[PDB]
């Protein structure tokens, strides 16, 4: 399968209540594996998956040195951006950064990305070619010229096509049992009478991995979105995911309706009926 | 593994 490593940075100013809070999270596919929180006690990059714990103490020293410095650059960024937009020093504002690398199932470089957001909206981002910039408004043009002078795009490209992919491959081997599994969904259907005459057929999908699933409802072998509720895929809390679909049907018409489940962990797409 | 490079906006 295809895989990815992704890092997420979030800095939140809090004027009058101390230094900005900085949260850093690391992800391989849908599995979070590292964490840093500027308010936490340890002040260290902490492991959040077991397979990363077999990295040595020098790895954790270096990740801690980088993430502590990155917390401060983004602290500076909050002040820089506040000036770019003529904003008072009373409001709380947010800085967000996300970068990573996708690899194909041959595990070689496929795609890279590096995005910056200020206050929940686009600020500056690298283009797919990893060579130019997309500046959102005109303030971001200031940063675009700053980063083109420092040749920043060429340096991110060097990390994404190199260190990013090669350490993603190492993580995929360090945790082959966790990261390379596919857990097919545990599916069942429930029936909940709510009315004198009408009923809800709920179609469950539990304990699957990865999170990519498709639940669609069919009536008489025909697709139907009318009268359907879909919840967004959610984590069970143990490294698996859940999702369900429900449709409202008239009583005595239940067995006109079929639920369909698509997941890469299933050799064939499942069909479920009320029985 | 994080990128070491520091970038300032």
């Amino acid at each position: 399968g295809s895989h990815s490593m992704r890092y997420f940075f979030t800095s939140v100013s809090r004027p009058g209540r101390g230094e900005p809070r900085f949260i850093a999270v690391g992800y391989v596919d849908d599995t979070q594996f590292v964490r840093f929180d500027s308010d936490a006690a340890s002040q260290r990059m902490e492991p959040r998956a077991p397979w990363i714990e077999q990295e040595g103490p020098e790895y954790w020293d270096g990740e801690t040195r980088k993430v502590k410095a990155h917390s401060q650059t983004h602290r500076v960024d909050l002040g820089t951006l506040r000036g770019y937009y003529n904003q008072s020093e009373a409001g709380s504002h947010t800085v967000q950064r996300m970068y990573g690398c996708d690899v194909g199932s041959d595990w070689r470089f496929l795609r890279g990305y590096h995005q910056y957001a200020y206050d929940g909206k686009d600020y500056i981002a690298l283009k797919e070619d990893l060579r130019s910039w997309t500046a959102a408004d005109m303030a971001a043009q200031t940063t675009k010229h700053k980063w083109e002078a420092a040749h920043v795009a060429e340096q991110l490209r060097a990390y994404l096509e190199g260190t990013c992919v090669e350490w993603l491959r190492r993580y995929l081997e360090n945790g082959k049992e966790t990261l390379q599994r596919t857990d097919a969904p545990k599916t069942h259907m429930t029936h909940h009478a709510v009315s004198d005459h009408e009923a809800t057929l709920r179609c469950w999908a539990l304990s699957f991995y990865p999170a990519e699933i498709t639940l669609t409802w069919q009536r008489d072998g025909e697709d139907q979105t009318q009268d359907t509720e879909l919840v967004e895929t959610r984590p069970a809390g143990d490294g698996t995911f859940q999702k369900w679909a429900a449709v409202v049907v008239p009583s005595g018409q239940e067995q006109r309706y079929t639920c369909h489940v698509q997941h890469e962990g299933l050799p064939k797409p499942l069909t479920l009926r009320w029985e | 593994r994080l990128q070491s490079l520091q970038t300032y906006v």
Partner: T-cell receptor
Amino acid sequence: AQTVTQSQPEMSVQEAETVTLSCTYDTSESDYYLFWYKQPPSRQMILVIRQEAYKQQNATENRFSVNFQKAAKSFSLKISDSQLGDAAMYFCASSGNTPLVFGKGTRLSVIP
Amino acid sequence: AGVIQSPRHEVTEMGQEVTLRCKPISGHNSLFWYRQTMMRGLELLIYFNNNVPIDDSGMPEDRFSAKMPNASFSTLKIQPSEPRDSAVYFCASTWGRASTDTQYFGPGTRLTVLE
């Protein structure tokens, strides 16, 4: 996790002859910069060469060329047709978690 | 029009206070402090970007401090001075857009702490 090594602390070159100042470094990154700095007895530090590790090409500055071997983690400085003004301390440096980390330095003495 | 260091040499008796001072190149938003001995070499002490300290892991355990009150100057303060502090203390500034910006060094300040 990020170290620079200059093993020969003293070097001597005959005037107008060429001299190579060795440097090896340790890093686990693919985005980094390599630098050579020169310190005359003035003590003012000045940049000689810069090598971006992504650029494959051996950066050259007139007489000053560099033998960048990314695989071997070596970054030797070649000074051709040396002159009396080249007598100084040369420092190998690298980018990384610390923006600049310097080697121990080599004192080049130029024999007139 | 370069990094200004104040003063060139400085001779102080131990126990006194020492305040090195440095002015970056105008326009530069980042400033680095180094110290040079021939025992340990060139070591980073602390650097700032937009007057915010980004890293001070290189600063001594107990008598050293550094401020950058505004973009125009930063002070490094030893209190109290000791003979082991004798070194050349360099200041460098960069544009402050990336940690790979080339660093522009000052002439240094040679500090000698006598018994």
